[PDB]
Amino acid sequence: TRIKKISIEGNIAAGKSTFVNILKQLSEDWEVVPEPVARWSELTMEQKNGGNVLQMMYEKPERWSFTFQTYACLSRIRAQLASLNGKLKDAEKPVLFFERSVYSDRYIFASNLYESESMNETEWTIYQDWHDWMNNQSLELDGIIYLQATPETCLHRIYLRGRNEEQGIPLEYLEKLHYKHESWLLHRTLKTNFDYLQEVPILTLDVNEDFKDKYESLVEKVKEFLSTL
């Protein structure tokens, strides 16, 4: 039928990859689109390019932010389109869960990088123009699931996940991304250039408590949420 498109949003190490890999196994009608950036962290040319630009960003973010953000967002659009045209053709209640969205790319990561002076105005305006247009009408979302975790939980989970590149990330940075997520998905203060987002239903799940072995209540909320869409 028509595939339902649901973004999973949340801070770094909130548990989106964990949650998405629980969901995919629970239904034959349920597919996931993993985040390209997450995959970058034998090799496809995307993964070669992605690792290089990721490493260079850790060296010099004010040189590479624009390049990274454009490639991260292009790679997400192509992976989302491939799943939308390659999967759930024989599903009765098809749902595709996106690990983050083109909207987190812009309004969380790229925005923060502009605010941190890692992109100058021209870079940021070119990026927004490119983004507005690269999204010329489809990946429009039926709903968003916000996995809400404290910056402290995410810091603890970065430690748990043990990526060497990430161990130095300060709480301040996580606090900044946290505040952007709260503004966009909870208080809904943040104004985007995508009218329909104002209307999109948002399910907010508290995932401060470990859920890897105790996720049934979260899944019950997803199923109830999906039934309303």
Ligand X SMILES: O=c1ccn([C@@H]2O[C@H](COP(=O)(O)OP(=O)(O)O)[C@@H](O)[C@H]2O)c(=O)[nH]1
Ligand Y SMILES: CCCN(c1nc(-c2nc(N)cc(N)n2)cs1)c1cc(-c2ccc(CCN3CCN(C)CC3)nc2)ccc1C
Active site (annotated) includes residue 99: yes
Binding to a second copy by CB under 8 A, coded x per residue (else -) over 75-114, reads ---x------------------------------------
28, 31, 59, 99: the catalytic one is 99
| 205 exposure class (CB count in 10 Å sphere: 0-12, 13-18, 19+) | buried
With CB under 5 to 8 Å by kind, the binding choice for 74 among a second copy, ligand X, Na ion, none is a second copy
With CB under 5 to 8 Å by kind, the binding choice for 18 among ligand X, Na ion, a second copy, none is ligand X
Radius of gyration of the chain (CA): 17
User: Which segments of the chain are extended strands (E)?
Assistant: 4-9, 30-33, 95-99, 143-148, 202-206
Cα separation, 206 vs 145, in Å, equals 11
Q: Which is nearer to Na ion, 24 or 191 (CB)?
A: 24
- CA–CA distance from 40 to each of 14, 17, 44, 55, 190 (Å)? 18, 14, 10, 10, 29
Q: How many CB atoms are closer than 10 A to CB 72?
A: 22
Q: Which of residues 131-170 bind ligand X (CB under 6 A)?
A: 157, 160-161
If one asks whether residue 105 binds ligand Y (CB under 6 A), the answer comes out as: yes
11 annotated as belonging to a binding site for a ligand: yes
Which listed residue (1, 21, 24, 191) binds Na ion by CB under 5 A? 24
Q: Using CA atoms in the order 192, 193, 199, 201, what is the torsion angle rounded to 10 degrees? A: -50
Active site residues: 99
Q: Which residues bind a second copy (CB under 8 A)?
A: 45-46, 48-49, 52-53, 56, 63, 66-67, 70-71, 74, 78, 122-123, 125-126, 129-130, 133
